[PDB]
Structures are given as C-alpha cells and as structure tokens.
Symmetry: D2
Subunit: 124 residues, 4 copies
C-alpha cells in the first residue's frame, strides 16, 4: 500500500494600474518587495535591500553590467515554496528590487495573460 | 495577491493474490476492510461491520444507510451504503468521488485532494 | 509501463460591476448566460432560456415546490470548460431575469473558488 | 474570461526482478531502450544506439573519461517520454555495456519524479 502526498499551490497577482506586477518574497528569511520585470531574467536587488540581507556595499565586486553590477547568489527565496541558490545581482536609482524570468520559470506553472500573473507550485 | 493551497495525495494498492483489491478505511474512526467491487454502486456492509458501527440490526428497513465519515487518503462525508457475504464492499459511488481512480494490471491507483 | 494522461483546464472569471459572477455556457449546443448563485443547488432556467432549449412550458410537470411551484428538468450537456452530462435543473419563476447556476453543478468541477473579484474554475477531461 | 488548458500525464514503472527500472523513449524519432541509473547524471548511449540515431562514430571527439574508458559528448535534440524534452545531454561510451542508461539530469526535468519501494513514478505536463 503505497501512499504519498504534497502541498500544491497557486498564486495569482493582478496587474497594478501603473501596468506592473508586484510580489512579496522572503529572501534568506527577510521580507522583500519586488516588482516583476519581464525583460530581466536575473533578480536585481537594490543596495538597500542588499544591506537588509547582510551584504557589504564597499566590499563588493561591481564587475558585470546591464544598465555596472555585482553578481551574487541567494541561499533561498520563498514565494509559495522554497527555491535554493538563486542568481541575482546588485545595482542605482531604483527604489524597488526587480524579479526576472529565471526565478519565475522555475515554477511548475507560470503564465501571464490578460492582467494576471499566475504561478503554480508544489512542495513536500 | 490571491493565494491558494491544498494537500494532494496518491494511494497505490497492489492486487491481492486472490485476484481482488482490498482497502482498509477508517469509518467514523473504526478500522474497516473493504473489497473493491467495480460493478457495485453504493457500499454494502456485512452485519458484523454494521454492528461495529453502533447500528441496530433488527430496527432497520437490504436496508439503506448513511456513513458520516469515511477516510481513505481524505475524509469523505456521508457515504451511501446498505446491508444484506464475507467482507464489506466498496463501489463506484464512493470511488467516483476521488479526483482520480484507475485500475491498471496489478495496480489500483487513487488520487485525492484535501485542503 | 503504466501510462495515463488527461486534459486539465482553468477558467478565471472576473466579477461583474454589479457584484455578481456570470458564466457563458453551451447547453445542448446553445449559448446560455448564467449567473452564479452560490447558495442555489440545481440550475434555475428562465422561461425564455427554457424555450430556447425546446422545452414546452405548458406540458412540463410542476412537481417541486418552494410559495410557488416549479418544473424539474434535465439538461443533456452543459459545456463550461468541459462537457458535463445529465445536469439537474428546473424552470424558475416568470420573474427570473437570468438563469442561475448553483452548487450541484459547481461541485462537479475538480476545483471551484471565489476570491475577491476572481472566480476560479478547474476541470479535467480525457 | 480567461481560459487555459494543458495535457498532464503520469508514467509508472515497476522494478524488474533484477532490481532495475527499464523504459523506452523516442529519441529523435527512434525508439531506444533504457535502463535507469540513479548514479548517472547524463544519458550514456551504446555505440549501437548512437549509430541507430545517425551519429557518425568516427567523427566524434572522445574527449571525456568515465569510471576507465573514454566517451564523446553529444546532444540529443529531442527525447519523448510522456512529453518531449529538448536538448538532452549525453555521451557515447567505449565501455561494453549492452543497454543505454538514463540518468538524473533527464529525470529531474520532470514536474514530478519519485522512486518508492519498487515503483518509479513520473509526472509531466505539456500543452
């Protein structure tokens, strides 16, 4: 008699009137507010949010570019379920961090249509 | 943010050596053993089993009944059944309520979803 | 190998400005607009909808009561996402503006929920 | 009215009495037989299955080494097991094993993958 089970889930975000989707995540167990960016793939953290996560700004290698930026790795990111070792980077103006496609395509299910962003996931 | 979640489950049971599938449920917290009958619709209890469930035999109408709670993977509410054989029987009326039910060779495969 | 597959689907419907949800469905190959009524049980059709579906109002048996008296019917096919068969209903009062879809049908879906302004339907077929 | 649908599927394999799971696939439209290897990552094709797929043996670069013998990396454009997966990693191995091996890098791509008692269960989702 074989028996198994898991937690399954769905998250829907509706598009704000400025036309973007906003979403909360826990990153290394800190609450971070993200705006979704369809053109990015990588997570773009603000400096402020980098500090909140226990990173040092004077001691970072701002090597790569997208606009100049410091690649980084995030132990865990939770949105529905926990993801691990998530590619990111930290760069200048912007007030809010940005979530790209890479993280979102890691979901079991992920579609945008109409004004809805719909994520499906499974845990254990 | 609209956010939703639930427990999804799967039970897989191997055919018995006698050619049948048997399943052990809790009925109102009481272990019971059912044989699967694909041709049957509602449940068919043995008197023995009827008695284990706090029923009166000689004050009934085969006599139609309702079972408050039947737990196979998840808890099914208010299951149709009756009483008249050796072992009690589980029919299509219960199995169709599962998200999934299929038999394939020596496996009976049951899918369910709770919250 | 034991192989198995099916079609899975999801329908998301936004609430209407008036506060209700509305579903368009094919019933016996005809388009009917329903209002969702989460505390109804079986489908309630308007007379006009009933007539669109070829029911003869003067020959039905008005055998159920509520204080009025209504006529049970069965609908062979109702297609919302997938095709459901032998759906229960009745013809409602002469006053009914729009037909109602209740829980007896909605609970046949694999998934159904309302959250704020979205009604979410999940279904699976062959 | 937002509406969306897709194909979902489950494949189950029972452990043969030798202890191994075996499963067939279409790779670039040819049926290939595999034995599952949880130790492996990549797909390990026999030389015979490579030629059956039209690899030119004598133009492959055998730049890799495994277990001791050499092997040439390849990409399999299309592999169908339930759903189609694209661009699967493999190599073709100078070792003399008679059957090709399917590793975790392909299994892990499934939406659901689990082994318990003697059942390997795979779940997938297409359109």
């Amino acid at each position: 008699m074989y028996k198994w089970s898991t937690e399954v889930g769905e998250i829907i975000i509706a598009r704000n009137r400025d036309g973007h989707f906003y979403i909360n995540a826990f990153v290394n167990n800190v609450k971070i507010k993200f705006m979704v960016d369809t053109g990015a793939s990588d997570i773009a953290l603000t400096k402020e949010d980098a500090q909140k996560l226990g990173f040092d700004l004077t001691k970072l290698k701002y090597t790569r570019t997208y606009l100049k930026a410091a690649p980084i790795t995030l132990n865990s990111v939770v949105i529905g379920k926990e993801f691990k070792n998530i590619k990111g980077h930290v760069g200048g103006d912007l007030d809010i961090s940005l979530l790209g496609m890479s993280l979102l395509e890691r979901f079991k299910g992920f579609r945008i249509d109409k004004d809805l962003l719909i994520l499906n996931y499974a845990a254990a």
